[PDB]
């Protein structure tokens, strides 16, 4: 495969603040949507939908073929207009490689492209923005190894 969506992979472990970690859907089971730079929604066919506090861990064993982990991140726009407040962190082995800082409902999505050469484990974290988990629907749009 020229690219492998995370939603094709099985995780080593996964926690979430609500429900199921959803493959190719938001945590509420909708098409994943994030806030675009034009103010409008951007919809994603593939991705991972979860809820703060969430930690999802993937082994990269047998996936050393790929150069980058790539995803868009943001508050899932099913929660536009709410108190949603989260941050995204990405780890490769035991170091943080991406940190969005605080993102609320109207915060434009961010793109992640981090190199995975020589790494064995990819960990995705969605934190609760320092308040509560209320409305903390965080989605990884187009999340993939490529
Ligand atoms: Ca929050």
The full set of domains in the chain, from first to last, is: 1-146 (2.60.120.1060)
| Residue owning tokens 């749009």 | 141
Residue 59 and residue 49: Cα distance in Å, rounded? 19
Q: What pairs with residue 90 in β-bridges?
A: 98, 124
Residues in the chain, total:
146
Q: Where are the beta strands (DSSP E) in 16-120?
A: 22-23, 32-35, 41-44, 47-51, 54-59, 68-75, 85-92, 95-99, 103-104, 110-115
**Residue 8 C-alpha to ligand 1 middle, in angstroms?**
28
**Residue 75 C-alpha to ligand 1 middle, in angstroms?**
10
3-state secondary structure (DSSP) of residue 79: helix
Tokens representing 60? Answer: 């990269």
3-state secondary structure (DSSP) of residue 103: strand
- What DSSP character marks residue 31? P
Tell me how the structure was determined.
X-ray
**Residue 61 C-alpha to ligand 1 middle, in angstroms?**
33
Is residue 73 within 8 Å of residue 100, measured between CB atoms?
Answer: yes
**Beta carbons within 8 Å of 112's beta carbon, 6+ residues apart:** 69, 70, 71, 72, 73, 88, 90, 98
Q: Which residues of 3-34 are buried (b: 16+ CB within 10 A; e: fewer)?
A: eebbbebebeebebbeeebbebbbbeebbbbb
Tokens representing 121? Answer: 């484990």
Neighbours of ion ligand 1 (CB under 5 A): 85, 128-129, 131, 136
Tokens representing 119? Answer: 């790494």
**Residue 10 C-alpha to ligand 1 middle, in angstroms?**
27
Tokens representing 112? Answer: 């992640």
Is residue 146 within 8 Å of residue 40, measured between CB atoms?
Answer: no
**Residue 85 C-alpha to ligand 1 middle, in angstroms?**
4
Is residue 32 within 8 Å of residue 43, measured between CB atoms?
Answer: yes
């Amino acid at each position: 495969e020229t690219s492998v969506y995370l939603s094709e992979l099985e995780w080593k472990s996964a926690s979430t603040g609500y429900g199921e970690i959803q493959k190719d859907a938001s945590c509420d089971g909708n098409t994943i949507t994030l806030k675009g730079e034009n103010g409008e929604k951007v919809s994603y066919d593939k991705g991972i939908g979860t809820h703060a506090h969430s930690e999802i861990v993937y082994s990269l064993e047998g996936l050393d073929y790929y150069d980058y982990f790539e995803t868009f991140v943001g508050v899932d726009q099913e929660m536009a207009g709410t108190v949603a407040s989260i941050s995204f962190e990405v780890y490769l082995d035991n170091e943080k490689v991406f940190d969005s800082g605080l993102m609320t409902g109207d915060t434009t999505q961010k793109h992640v492209k981090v190199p995975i050469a020589g790494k064995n484990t990819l960990k995705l974290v969605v934190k609760d923005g320092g308040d509560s988990i209320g409305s903390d629907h965080g989605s990884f749009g187009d999340a993939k190894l490529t």
